[PDB]
Design an enzyme around this catalytic site. Structure first.
Site, PDB file in Angstrom:
ATOM      1  N   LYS B  10       1.060  -1.139  -0.109  1.00  0.00           N
ATOM      2  CA  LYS B  10      -0.018  -0.012  -0.088  1.00  0.00           C
ATOM      3  C   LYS B  10       1.075   1.159   0.020  1.00  0.00           C
ATOM      4  O   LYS B  10       1.851   1.256   0.749  1.00  0.00           O
ATOM      5  CB  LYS B  10      -1.045  -0.190   1.153  1.00  0.00           C
ATOM      6  N   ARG B  12       1.562   5.534  -2.546  1.00  0.00           N
ATOM      7  CA  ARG B  12       0.782   6.386  -3.450  1.00  0.00           C
ATOM      8  C   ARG B  12       0.633   5.675  -4.619  1.00  0.00           C
ATOM      9  O   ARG B  12      -0.088   6.225  -5.361  1.00  0.00           O
ATOM     10  CB  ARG B  12       1.787   7.492  -3.565  1.00  0.00           C
ATOM     11  N   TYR B  13       1.276   4.707  -5.047  1.00  0.00           N
ATOM     12  CA  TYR B  13       0.840   4.114  -6.492  1.00  0.00           C
ATOM     13  C   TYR B  13      -0.531   3.532  -6.385  1.00  0.00           C
ATOM     14  O   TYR B  13      -1.318   3.535  -7.267  1.00  0.00           O
ATOM     15  CB  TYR B  13       1.833   2.792  -6.625  1.00  0.00           C
ATOM     16  N   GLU B  15      -2.628  -0.075  -4.052  1.00  0.00           N
ATOM     17  CA  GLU B  15      -2.458  -1.057  -3.213  1.00  0.00           C
ATOM     18  C   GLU B  15      -2.325  -2.575  -4.259  1.00  0.00           C
ATOM     19  O   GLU B  15      -2.788  -2.611  -5.180  1.00  0.00           O
ATOM     20  CB  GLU B  15      -3.688  -1.417  -2.351  1.00  0.00           C
ATOM     21  N   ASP B 127      11.966   2.185 -14.704  1.00  0.00           N
ATOM     22  CA  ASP B 127      11.961   2.245 -13.465  1.00  0.00           C
ATOM     23  C   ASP B 127      12.284   1.098 -12.758  1.00  0.00           C
ATOM     24  O   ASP B 127      11.624   0.459 -11.831  1.00  0.00           O
ATOM     25  CB  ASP B 127      10.490   2.565 -12.755  1.00  0.00           C
TER      26      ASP B 127
END
Ligand SMILES: COc1cc(-c2cncc(-c3ccc(C4CCN(C)CC4)cc3)c2C)cc(OC)c1OC
Ligand SMILES: COc1cc(-c2cncc(-c3ccc(C4CCN(C)CC4)cc3)c2C)cc(OC)c1OC
Ligand SMILES: COc1cc(-c2cncc(-c3ccc(C4CCN(C)CC4)cc3)c2C)cc(OC)c1OC
Ligand SMILES: COc1cc(-c2cncc(-c3ccc(C4CCN(C)CC4)cc3)c2C)cc(OC)c1OC
Lengths: 282, 290
Positions: B10, B12-13, B15, B127
């Site tokens: 969990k 800011r992306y 969950e 990333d």
């Protein structure tokens, strides 16, 4: 939490695009469009649009879901929407005639959906042009209003159906860098839809048979050249029957059609001006 | 149908959940609306049937669902109960065979991404980091999170950089990303950014390989030189102004394997991006190292 995703497919359309099914989810009808690999870009464009702005309007087909599923050797692409059991306006106009109230309700509901697409709202939605408006891409609701379907060619600020292409599309003069160009292409197509509907409105015991625009001057599945010769070179427009000029509603709709069909795209009425005109008729 | 059983992540992306589907564990990522452009990009990338590979996270489904003004964005994948490489490296040390199996598997996945098949476009990840690598029960890893990916076809001369304002994880950003001089219309630029990040992941793994009864504690890249929760400018200072690279523990130079890996890391870390090794050359070098 359980996430019930199962849809039972119970087929209401099949084409090059793929298929549309009546389906059931949690006892509720849904419509499921299953895309052919040939038209995957239509699923991606509609999905990208709905990921940008969740359109919600009584005259836009209601979005429920976009689903991609992995198969063996392929990807399955589904668009799930509200289901309108009366089917498309194209369907409906073949087996029904209209009175004045039902004709105006249809065309004002389409103008309302189109003006909602076209308008930028700040805070809201980007402006959107449809780019494939036609009577097969409009559904009839039980309350007598319609909704606009198929945003697979839409543009935010595959080619359109050739029969409904504006002159600037056919002669390749459209200013492709100018968003307002795309709205004006939609207004041309709207005018052809208005003509299709108005023919089915009874006046003084008379009605025209359902015909598609330009039925009298181009073949079925007309070519790009066939359309260019009619619309651009000869500058033909759909026939307004004499009997319309005995009826005040059809006289007003004929004037409105004409103002959607100017050769000069910037002379055409806006969707908001069409709505206003339709609210003052009758 | 899917049952969500427990939250395994969990932030800011969004969950990630462990769920059940047809008897099997699956991973269900629920995106935040703040990250809706990553969801769409990942969906575009997984539409490539020839993306499938043992060392790329396996796709099951992608969904966007809405009623009224509420939109849910779902990605459903294979579930790896051993978690990410970042998790695993804190819990275990490695022997030579395990260390090489891990890093060769990551190189194999990265080379698969980078190489065009005439098919699959060439793909740069943008990333790569140890939290975006999952550990499998066969001792190999798979690369996850294609939400920032760039696609290129030399065969049609097309470059698709997408429309995502998201940027890479700051700790793993190459010098040309941190100084914002990266050539954004050059596909090779993005592959070279992946190579820098791969070198950092190599360093993270190698620290955990035992030699001569010595191992280093797990640390993230640049742990010693930046503040906790480093900013873009914190990373720019150490990488670009200070020209810092991760330190090579001197104990590695006693072990032939770690000596070879230190050489490979350094060839991922040139300031000149065009000097960096390719993913294929890393894969070939790791195939030969024992
Ligand atoms: C993944 O796929 C499909 C899912 C569904 C579906 C079924 N039940 C429940 C849902 C649901 C909606 C919203 C939330 C909220 C509740 C809590 N809140 C804080 C944030 C999240 C949770 C669950 C959905 C989205 C239907 C589908 O088809 C009609 C799906 O396939 C396209
Ligand atoms: C245009 O585009 C889309 C439309 C729909 C859609 C939604 N409600 C109802 C329908 C429908 C139902 C039934 C009939 C009848 C017609 C007469 N006779 C032949 C038997 C069948 C026709 C039409 C459709 C086709 C869904 C879509 O996506 C899920 C569309 O694509 C965006
Ligand atoms: C995709 O479509 C359909 C979805 C659903 C559905 C199923 N489970 C849960 C939900 C839901 C619950 C709660 C929130 C919000 C409430 C406020 N805040 C706390 C954030 C979370 C959102 C969503 C929904 C909307 C039902 C539908 O029809 C009955 C759908 O239509 C076919
Ligand atoms: C990176 O990206 C994605 C990853 C995954 C995914 C797949 N299997 C397993 C996991 C996982 C399970 C469990 C833990 C544990 C580890 C120890 N401790 C921290 C408690 C938790 C960590 C990780 C994840 C996160 C799915 C995704 O999409 C569905 C991802 O996004 C593409």
């Amino acid at each position: 939490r359980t996430v019930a995703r199962d849809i039972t497919l119970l087929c209401v359309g099949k084409g090059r695009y793929g298929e549309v099914w009546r389906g059931s989810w949690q006892g509720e009808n849904v419509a499921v469009k299953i895309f052919s690999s040939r038209d995957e870009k239509s699923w991606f464009r509609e999905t990208e649009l709905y990921n940008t702005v969740m359109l919600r309007h009584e005259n836009i087909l209601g979005f429920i879901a976009s689903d991609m599923t992995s198969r063996h050797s392929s990807t399955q692409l589904w668009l799930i929407t509200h289901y309108h059991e009366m089917g498309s306006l194209y369907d409906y106009l073949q087996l029904t005639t209209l009175d004045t109230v039902s004709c105006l309700r249809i065309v004002l509901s389409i103008a309302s959906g189109l003006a909602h697409l076209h308008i930028e709202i700040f805070g809201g939605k980007p402006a959107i042009a449809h780019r494939d408006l036609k009577s097969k891409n409009i559904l009839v609701k039980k309350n007598g209003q319609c909704c606009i379907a198929d945003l697979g060619l839409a543009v935010m600020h595959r080619v359109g159906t050739k029969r409904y292409m504006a002159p600037e599309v056919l002669d390749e003069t459209i200013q492709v860098d100018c968003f307002d160009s795309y709205k004006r292409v939609d207004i041309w197509a709207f005018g052809l839809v208005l003509w299709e509907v108005a023919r089915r409105m009874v006046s003084n015991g008379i009605v025209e048979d359902y015909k598609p625009p330009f039925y009298d001057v181009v073949p079925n599945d007309p070519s790009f050249e066939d359309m260019r010769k009619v619309v651009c070179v000869d500058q033909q427009r759909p026939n307004i029957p004499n009997r319309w000029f005995s009826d005040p509603t059809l006289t007003s709709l004929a004037k409105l059609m004409k103002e959607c069909w100017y050769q000069n795209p910037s002379a055409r009425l806006t969707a908001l001006r069409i709505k206003k005109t339709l609210t003052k008729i009758d």
